[PDB]
Amino acid sequence: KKKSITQSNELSPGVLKTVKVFVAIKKRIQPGDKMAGRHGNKGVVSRVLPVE
Amino acid sequence: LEFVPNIQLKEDLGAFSYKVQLSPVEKGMAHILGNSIRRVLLSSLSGASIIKVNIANVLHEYSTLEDVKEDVVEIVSNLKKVAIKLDTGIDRLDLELSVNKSGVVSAGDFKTTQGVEIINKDQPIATLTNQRAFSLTATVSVGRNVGILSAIPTELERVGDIAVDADFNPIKRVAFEVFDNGDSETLEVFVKTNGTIEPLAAVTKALEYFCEQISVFVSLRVP
């Protein structure tokens, strides 16, 4: 945890500092996505109808 | 030549299943009342549910506490399946939960403040492998379903706040059948809910809504 290069890398000379950012986001299915059963059938979700 | 129905709670059964009845009808209007009841009962009835939660030592949903077999997002999913009953004019309040046990944290351990109700007493919220502290809140709010599109993202204020999407409408199944009695029929409606309302009140409410919506065509005016 400290046997790095005092900055965690050789830094590929020329580079002062760098930062990594990690962003996560849930996604729900919507008209346009692509479903397909295991039997070679597929299609594009065309609408979403109310329960009733 | 005059028939008018009265409503009756015959034939309770099962977990929360019922068979409500309207005894005399107009010999032809039955199959209208049935469909109207079903659809309006499946789309507009409003209840209450958890919408936003803040756990103690957490910052976001993809995290992990110590000595907890569960996860944070698994916990948030557990919370969604709690059946809450609110009284007439509450419309917003706060729930609390603080425990120091070493087993399974069921939903019964919510604080038994006034107004609130927690029907789903068996539902686990989290499992504590070892004894530790644990605490959170959850703002319970009235509401009704509107569709995946016209829903506002429920602004957050504090640091640890975590939005929880909420399914309001407490109805799970509806189905009707119409029986003939000679110049008269009887309507026999099945209802199944989560237990957060009583059937008679429910169907009465739905017919209230429906006739309220019809009452414009008696006028053929604006409002």
Sequential DSSP letters for B35-96 = HHHHHHHTTT--EEEEEEEEETT-SSSS---TTBSS-HHHHHHHHHT--B---TT--EEEEE
Which tokens is B46 given? 């409003």
- H/E stretch holding B190: strand B185-193
Residues B80 and B136 in one domain: yes
* Cα separation, B77 vs B24, whole angstroms: 45
Residues B7 and B107 in one domain: no
Q: Which long-range contacts (CB under 8 A, 24 or more apart) does B27-31 make?
A: B27/B3, B27/B183, B27/B184, B27/B185, B30/B178, B30/B185, B30/B186, B30/B187, B31/B178
Examine the domain organization and report whether B160 and B173 are in the same domain. Answer: no
Chain B partners of A50 at a C-beta cutoff of 8 Å?
Answer: 43, 147
Q: Are residues B57 and B100 in the same domain?
A: yes
Domain end call among B123, B144, B168 = B168
Residue B114 carries which DSSP code? S
Cα distances (Å, whole numbers) of residue B124 to A49, B30, B55, B85: 32, 43, 16, 18
In chain B, the number of structural domains is: 2
Q: Are B159 and B184 within one domain?
A: no
Please tell me the distance from the alpha carbon of residue B211 to that of residue B198, in angstroms, as a whole number: 20
Residue B13 is classified by DSSP as B
* Resolution, expressed in angstroms to one decimal: 3.5
CB B123 within 8 A of CB B21: no
Query: Is the domain of B73 the same as that of B3?
Result: no
Alpha-carbon span B52 to B59, nearest angstrom:
14
- How many angstroms separate the most distant Cα atoms in chain A? 64
Q: At which residue do the structure tokens 């999407």 appear? A: B165
Asked if residue B123 and residue B28 are part of one domain, the reply reads no
Whole-angstrom CA distances from A6 to A1, A3, A12, B194 are 10, 7, 14, 60
A10 touches chain B (CB under 8 A): no
Nearest Cα neighbor of B60 from B78, B82, B76 is B76
Q: Of B93, B95, B47, nearest to B198 (Cα)?
A: B47
Asked how this structure was determined, the answer is: cryo-EM
Q: Which residues of B touch A28 (CB under 8 A)?
A: 148
**Alpha-carbon gap: A39 to the closest alpha carbon of chain B (Å):** 30
| Contacts with A24 from chain B: Cβ below 8 Å | 62
Residue in chain B lying closest to A49 (CA)? B147
Among B168, B188, B209, which residue terminates a domain? Answer: B168
B57 and B71 inside one domain:
yes
Q: How far apart are CA B118 and CA B107, in angstroms?
A: 7
Which SS3 state, helix, strand or coil, does residue B48 take? strand
Within this chain, do residues B78 and B145 fall inside the same structural domain, yes or no?
Answer: yes
Cα separation, A47 vs B149, whole angstroms: 13
Domain that residue B87 falls in: 47-168
B41 and B127 inside one domain: no
The amino acid occupying position B166 is A
CB–CB contact B43 A50 (8 Å): yes
Same domain, yes or no: B36 and B113? no
- Contact residues for A43 (Cβ-Cβ < 8 A; gap 6+): A34, A35, A36
Interhelix angle B30-41/B199-214, rounded to 10 degrees, is 100
Letter string b/e over residues A29-40, b meaning 16 or more CB atoms within 10 A of that residue's CB: eeeeeeeeeeee
Chain-centre distance for alpha carbon B63:
29
Q: Are residues B65 and B145 in the same domain?
A: yes
DSSP state, residue B77: H
As a residue count, chain B comes to 223
